[PDB]
Design a protein around this nucleic acid. Structure first.
Length: 48
DNA sequence: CAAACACACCAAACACAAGAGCTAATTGACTGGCCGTTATCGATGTATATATCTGACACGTGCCTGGAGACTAGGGAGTAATCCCCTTGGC
């Protein structure tokens, strides 16, 4: 794609049926900096 | 015979079962006794609405008193003539 030179090996390309799972990235990314604390033991909370 | 320890067996518990990471949803106490507030039922009225009886005013009927009508009886009031007493009038 970049230079326009043929690829020495012959790639294997064709139609094929692909799915998409629900595991998006934005639903898993998480971070913390001195968030809310628990009431029993004064430690950070659990769960995104 | 009684006491020491050892062994095999039976009976009784302890603690562990990798690192974690994300998401969802089921549970949101309940009869009863009792006090405290408040809603309701009840009496004890006084105020207002209506019914009965009494009093004053009004229209109407009435009993009673006095007044009025037609008719009568018979005599009181009243013309027409007369006398002559007496008054007005006179010198």
């Amino acid at each position: 794609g970049f230079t326009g030179r043929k690829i020495t090996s012959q790639i294997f390309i064709g139609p094929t049926y692909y799915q998409r799972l629900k595991h998006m990235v934005d639903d898993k990314i998480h971070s913390r900096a001195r968030g809310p604390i628990q009431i029993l033991n004064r430690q950070p909370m659990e769960g995104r």
